[PDB]
């Protein structure tokens, strides 16, 4: 019921279909709130299209916290998953 380190790390290592629709979903409105990008953008607009470019070089500064149904954590940095 607490933080679960890398030894007891027993979920799938794959960025599922709902992760990349949420990480891009919650990164994109940070760009529309004047947050700094990390990537070499070209002359380019539309803070969603600069958000899915930043997922290709894996420079999202976030981490996904998977809850098991018994009240247990599980953390996964967004660089660690592959898609």
């Amino acid at each position: 019921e607490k933080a679960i380190p890398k030894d007891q790390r027993a979920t799938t290592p794959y960025m599922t279909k709902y992760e990349r629709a949420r990480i891009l979903g919650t990164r994109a409105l940070q760009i529309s709130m004047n947050a700094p990008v990390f990537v070499d953008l070209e002359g380019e607009t539309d803070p969603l299209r600069i958000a899915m470019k930043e997922l290709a070089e894996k420079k999202i500064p976030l981490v996904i916290r998977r809850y098991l149904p018994d009240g247990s954590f599980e953390d996964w940095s967004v660089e660690e998953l592959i898609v």
Binding site: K17, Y18, R20, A21, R22, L24, G25, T26, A28, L29, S32, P47, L48, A51
Partner: peptide
Amino acid sequence: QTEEARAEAINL
């Protein structure tokens, strides 16, 4: 007409 439902309509 958010920025997080504009991104979620495409990828899902």
